[PDB]
Design a protein around this ligand. Structure first.
Ligand SMILES: *[C@@H]1O[C@H](CO)[C@@H](O)[C@H](O)[C@H]1NC(C)=O
Lengths: 49, 44
């Protein structure tokens, strides 16, 4: 059965665009991962790295 | 982590196999996740 969309009425029957995300953690090498922040660089001081 | 190593030494004149020292450099450490027991060479 078709949805029968309409723009003239309020919420409930409105078009709601949906995108989903699926994740899993299997014993595999890390391939798809997020960003890592990079800081500045300093010299001639006993600092951490 | 399928490792391959390649070395291109053309400095040998060549009759059977050279007698010298050489090293092998890494190219890629790509993973496949499945073990390999047999292989074959593709020729054109
Ligand atoms: C290794 O390969 C054999 C077949 O050659 C297979 O039966 C076995 O399951 C493989 N090992 C793993 C850990 O999958």
């Amino acid at each position: 059965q078709s949805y029968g969309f309409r723009p003239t009425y309020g919420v409930g029957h409105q078009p709601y665009r949906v995108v989903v995300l699926s994740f899993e953690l299997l014993h595999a090498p890390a391939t798809v991962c997020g960003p890592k922040k990079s800081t500045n660089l300093v010299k001639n001081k006993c600092v951490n790295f | 982590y399928f490792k391959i190593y390649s070395k291109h030494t053309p400095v040998n004149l060549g009759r059977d196999l050279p007698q010298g020292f050489s090293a092998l450099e890494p190219l890629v450490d790509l993973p496949i996740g499945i073990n390999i027991t047999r292989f074959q060479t593709l020729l054109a």
